[PDB]
Design a binder for this molecule. Sequence first.
Ligand code: A1AM7
Ligand code: ZN
Length: 140
Amino acid sequence: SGAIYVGNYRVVNRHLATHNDWANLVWEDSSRDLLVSSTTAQGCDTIARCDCQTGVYYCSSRRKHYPVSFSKPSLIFVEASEYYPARYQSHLMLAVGHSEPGDCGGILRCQHGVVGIVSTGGNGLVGFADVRDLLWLDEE
Ligand SMILES: O=c1ccncn1CCO
Ligand SMILES: [Zn+2]
């Protein structure tokens, strides 16, 4: 589990979105595993605006933050998980690291702020859904 709290937006994995999230929907994309909903209180996170390929992510299944190198956001084939079939996922970044299904929502951050959230795992890789292209998260 995990979210990004930027302004009056809550960014979650689409597959973990709650009824309250869908009842307050701003934007969702199944191909990216992302959903954004509205919040009453302002959030403590800043979104990275950059093309960094090094950062640190939080891994709940280890209680640890790991420094990683990661690929630029791509369209990637993902094998079946407990929450999705084998499919193509867009705006995905891969690193070598530990990721189980419950690690989804862990933040990846660089020197500029929050890059994305854990979205995929297995075979010794961790995939992150990028949010740095979502410039509208910073305004209105
Ligand atoms: O801090 C750690 C590290 C590894 N396993 C457990 N704990 C306790 C709280 O979950
Ligand atoms: Zn950066």
